[PDB]
RNA sequence: AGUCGGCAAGCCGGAUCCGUAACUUCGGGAUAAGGAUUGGCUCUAAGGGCUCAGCCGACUUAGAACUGGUGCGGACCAGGGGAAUCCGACUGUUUAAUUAAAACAAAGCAUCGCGAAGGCCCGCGGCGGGUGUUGACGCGAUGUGAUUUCUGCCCAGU
RNA sequence: GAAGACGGUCGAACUUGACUAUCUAGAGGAAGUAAAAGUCGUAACAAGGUUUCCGUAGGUGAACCUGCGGAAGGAUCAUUA
RNA sequence: UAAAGUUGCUGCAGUUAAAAAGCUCGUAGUUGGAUCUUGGGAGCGGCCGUCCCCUGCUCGGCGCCGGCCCGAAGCGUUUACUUUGAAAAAAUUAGAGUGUUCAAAGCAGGCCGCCUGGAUACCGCAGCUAGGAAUAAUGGAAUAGGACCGCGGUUCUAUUUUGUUGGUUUUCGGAACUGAGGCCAUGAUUAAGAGGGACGGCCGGGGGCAUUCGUAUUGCGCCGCUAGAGGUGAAAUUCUUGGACCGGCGCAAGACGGACCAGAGCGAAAGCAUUUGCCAAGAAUGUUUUCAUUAAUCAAGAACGAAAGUCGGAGGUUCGAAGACGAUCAGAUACCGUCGUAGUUCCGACCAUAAACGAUGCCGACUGGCGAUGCGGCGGCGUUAUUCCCAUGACCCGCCGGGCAGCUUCCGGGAAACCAAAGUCUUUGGGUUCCGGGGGGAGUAUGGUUGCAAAGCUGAAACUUAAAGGAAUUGACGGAAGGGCACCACC
RNA sequence: ACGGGGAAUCAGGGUUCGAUUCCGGAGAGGGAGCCUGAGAAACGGCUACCACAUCCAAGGAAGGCAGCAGGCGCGCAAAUU
């Protein structure tokens, strides 16, 4: 069965982009969901998207640019300290130059950088490049 | 307790008569001391008293029957012909 | 990986537990019938006796009569067949000596040319072959 | 997909959006209660007060000209059934496919489908019993179920 | 070590508490094998009826102390054991008065005859008689001999 | 206040038996691998000259053969109102 | 130890190279849909960055005119997670200082008595302390024994009090109970392109039992006419004037269910086909029905499981392991032929294996078209049936769901063959079972277990070996096919 | 298999070792018993038994290097009485 929501969003915009659609329609919308496709929105990899939410899960239509090469998801989602945050952007990310690591703290959801600058780790969702 | 592991009924033979006489019989024996439901009263009391004899202890009503079961297979299949080729007659 | 599950620990580690000994090297190291077997007894070298010097065929079209010894170790008491390793140099040994045996360098495995022999002569009565071979020592009697 | 077949059909009802009560409908509150409580009087199972309810009278769902659903509302007047009917209409079948076993034994795939639905009744069982819908001793056996219908 | 041969004799023996193998048709083997205990005396505990308390009533088990020249199922009564082979499955029967067996029987298995004017059989005789107050799941005639696993080739001879 | 003694306790050790682990002798039997170029065939690879293979039975010097049901890893992706 | 991403958590593999249990059920285990507080404001910098606020209820001094301000002490769902702090032997490791002549070291040394060093970091996991509240669990009130607000009575009790000396009752503070209230916006998120169940009309070689029909085959009876019939590459064994084969008419028995029959349907798989009846079951579809997370996958465990085989009965037409024989052959204990036992059939128990194959676990999502097809539903000209039209059938054109498939392609993958899955994989993580680690030895030995047996399940090692194997290519070869040629080929 | 601090090897993960100078434990041939003392079931303290072994005048007496050296043995394998 669908275990995993945000994963199943997450591999349906990357099908999606690699086909090279205009925008995607993901059908459950969780608050996850919306809050990480903004991560993405906030850096530009993403354009505006929709949340048509109707009486159940809604659906959101996430309008997509030509800039995203892949946005996986991790799973579990593990535990990160501050210390072996680097390591796991060492092994994630393409680069050091591009690419987000998105993980939630108790500060919200954020990516890896912004989570250096609140100065707290928490559990990791995805990553996006 | 379960006293015996695959010895039933037939355990009072002991180590006699072999391994397959001493199990062919256990599914008859088993059988012509059961007691059966009396079709007519409804309790379960129909009790072999001799061979071919079935007797209800509630009805006391008495049944000719199969010699090991109440009711032998090639005898059902009797009676059901039977009531084919009655109502086929007459029509 | 199969199973991501977060506790699944246990499920994950007595897998790999249990895999490992379908690895043909792990097996022989974690079991003793590896270690009974091998007559040094995972020693490196070993000294025994020899008791006669016996001619190995080779097998494939690599045709020759390799020189080897039929030793009996000391240690255990088995007996093996060590090769002789270079050239003339049968004449050395002679019978009823002791002689420092090593393995050949396959760790327990048939060398090339010879046919079930996993072991050479390193020394002979207390003084290296190959001291022997080169002339710097000869063999006091 | 089915739980207990191959099957992945895609068949169900799909309520409107807009959860208004009909603009057509002219029965109150209390009236289709009242008319809930009689159809539940001469005998009838929540499922099937609701077809009987929007077909006659015409009531999209009882969820929303009242604030209360049929069983809930059954409940609070001590109509409802003490066993859910889901688990009765799963009985009531064990004890059909039980009863046509007897004489057919060698009907193997009545026996297979006789350990589905057995299957079946254990796990809604251990569901009720976690909600506390029955007895947490309840047991369904085999020789007594055929006692309820 | 005697002797054809442990023949004869002996050992073992009851009960309580432990413990019990190969093999097996899973039932057994089995009291397997192998151990320990056992007296007398003085106590304690537990096990019931009848009207909480009182009044009646029986036997039995377990435990403890003391004690005797370590003796105690003190007489009587009372299994030597083990592991292997051969034969017969077993229980049963048999040569009264030299043979109790491996022989006979046996269940099981398999053949054969017969639908009654019949099969088998008796009888000097008869519309005779037995099976038979019977009817093929029966009666009559043979072989083999529980179970398990099998049962090969030969219809020339007779 | 010594020797010594009765009883108790801890209890080495010995005897015996059982269980267990490891090593090891063994007539004979039956395999595996290696050595060589032996004997008898030719089962398989081409439709390998009876298509091959699987499961299961039985049989035969030996590979194998045959029966029943499968498979194509087939020599047919096809055969006509 | 690295190399070894050849033990793979990061990070392997399982269509064909080693490999997914025959199939389903199922407990532990693992994993689980969505949903409950965001915004606004003062200040600062060039609509943007940062700060604080949305905390409630004993004691004291900037004090001021019972109230306010402030300070301290106590209380305010619980864990996981994260941040902080504490507590955390040295030596070693990292690392600061220092010219042991350098360095490995060492903890020393440096200035004309003084000046300094002997630091610091990391030390998980568990436990302790403080903050955060996303994520993930868990709880609250829907028989209200719910929360608050004041009450009224009952019982005991600190007592402050009765000026002191006593008893007593109380206001008094506390503890508990019991009646009447008042008040709450009085308490139930949604109804999953999750699941269960109900209901509706259907559908299907699904299953079971009973019943019915069909030729054929074998055998028998009778009749006809006859000398061969069978069988084969060719023959023989075999049948035959005691009348075979062939033709006719009957009868009996046991099998089997042709053509229709399809890259059609149904079933968990094995599998399932004459008629009609009965019995119970089911998918898909339809659904403004109900329940409300009940789910997914699953060690242990359980049901079913072709054929063969086994044990009992019944029956034994055909076929036919074994066997016998006739051919063939160097031999054939084989292929071919004639007989023919077990079996093949049914009933009742066992067995649990197949190339049980799609050689491809299941659940979920996403990613091209195209023409069909099966079932259900919806829509639409027209045609044809009842006829008397509407409605129903049969066609015709579409759409929807899922079902077996096909075609197509630079989706993408793959060693390739090939695959809309074997794709979304170094851009590596949806969930979860099983299972592989060079070839042999070997699915063997042994132990255990199941079975009447056959055997099944579990399952090594010694030893041996440098390859074994996969896909594809070019050749050669073929008692393979299709074309063509030569008197060193034939006619 | 004495445990740990640690060691080897590594990109990130890991894998393997840790008898060995620091801490903790255990033991003095094998078991057992105990005296003295604040502290021992001590062994460079006693008492037994078992194993091994020394001196004897044959009556007896005496012993415990897994302390530092050293010897024998054992071994592929380890230093100065």
């Given at each position: 069965v669908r275990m995993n929501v945000l994963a199943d969003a997450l591999k349906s915009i990357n099908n999606a982009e690699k086909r090279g659609k205009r925008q995607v329609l993901i059908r459950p919308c969780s608050k996850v969901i919306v809050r990480f496709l903004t991560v993405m929105m906030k850096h530009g990899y993403i354009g505006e998207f929709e949340i048509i939410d109707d009486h159940r899960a809604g659906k959101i239509v996430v309008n997509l640019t030509g800039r995203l090469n892949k946005c996986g998801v991790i799973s579990p989602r593990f535990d990160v300290q501050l210390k072996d945050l680097e390591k796991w952007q060492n092994n994630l990310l393409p680069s050091r130059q591009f690419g987000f690591i998105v993980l939630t703290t108790s500060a919200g959801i954020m990516d890896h950088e912004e989570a250096r600058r609140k100065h707290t780790g928490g559990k990791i969702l995805g990553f996006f490049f | 307790a379960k006293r015996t592991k695959k010895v039933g009924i037939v355990g009072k033979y002991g180590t006699r008569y072999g391994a397959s006489l001493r199990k062919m019989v256990k599914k008859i024996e088993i059988s012509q001391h059961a007691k059966y439901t009396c079709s007519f009263c409804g309790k379960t009391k129909m009790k072999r008293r001799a061979v071919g004899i079935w007797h209800c202890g509630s009805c006391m009503k008495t049944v000719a029957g199969g010699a090991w079961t109440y009711n032998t297979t090639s005898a059902v299949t009797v009676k059901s012909a039977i009531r084919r080729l009655k109502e086929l007659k007459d029509q | 990986g199969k199973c991501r599950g977060l506790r699944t620990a246990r499920k994950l580690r007595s897998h790999r537990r249990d895999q490992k000994w379908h690895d043909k090297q792990y097996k022989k190291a974690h079991l003793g019938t590896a270690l009974k077997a091998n007559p040094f007894g995972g020693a490196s070298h070993a000294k025994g006796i020899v008791l006669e010097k016996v001619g190995v065929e080779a097998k494939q079209p690599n045709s020759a009569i390799r020189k080897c010894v039929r030793v009996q170790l000391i240690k255990n008491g088995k007996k093996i067949t060590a090769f002789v390793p270079n050239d003339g140099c049968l004449n050395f040994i002679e019978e009823n000596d002791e002689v420092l045996v090593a393995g050949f360098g396959r760790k327990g495995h048939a060398v090339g040319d010879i046919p079930g022999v996993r072991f050479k002569v390193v020394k002979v009565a207390n003084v290296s072959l190959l001291a022997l071979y080169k002339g710097k020592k000869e063999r006091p009697r | 997909g089915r739980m207990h077949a191959p099957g992945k059909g895609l068949s169900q009802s799909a309520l409107p959006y807009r959860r208004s009560v009909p603009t057509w409908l002219k029965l109150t509150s209390?009236?289709?209660?009242?008319?809930?409580?009689?159809?539940?009087?001469?005998?009838?199972?929540?499922?099937?007060?609701?077809?009987?309810?929007?077909?006659?009278?015409?009531?999209?769902?009882?969820?929303?000209?009242?604030?209360?659903?049929?069983?809930?509302?059954?409940?609070?007047?001590?109509?409802?059934?003490?066993?859910?009917?889901?688990?009765?209409?799963?009985?009531?079948?064990?004890?059909?496919?039980?009863?046509?076993?007897?004489?057919?034994?060698?009907?193997?795939?009545?026996?297979?489908?006789?350990?589905?639905?057995?299957?079946?009744?254990?796990?809604?069982?251990?569901?009720?019993?976690?909600?506390?819908?029955?007895?947490?001793?309840?047991?369904?056996?085999?020789?007594?179920?055929?006692?309820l219908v």
């Open positions: - | - | - | 209390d009236d289709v209660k009242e008319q809930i409580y009689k159809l539940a009087k001469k005998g009838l199972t929540p499922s099937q007060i609701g077809v009987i309810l929007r077909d006659s009278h015409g009531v999209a769902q009882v969820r929303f000209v009242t604030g209360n659903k049929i069983l809930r509302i059954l409940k609070s007047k001590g109509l409802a059934p003490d066993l859910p009917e889901d688990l009765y209409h799963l009985i009531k079948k064990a004890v059909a496919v039980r009863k046509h076993l007897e004489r057919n034994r060698k009907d193997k795939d009545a026996k297979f489908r006789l350990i589905l639905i057995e299957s079946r009744i254990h796990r809604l069982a251990r569901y009720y019993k976690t909600k506390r819908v029955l007895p947490p001793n309840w047991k369904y056996e085999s020789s007594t179920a055929s006692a």
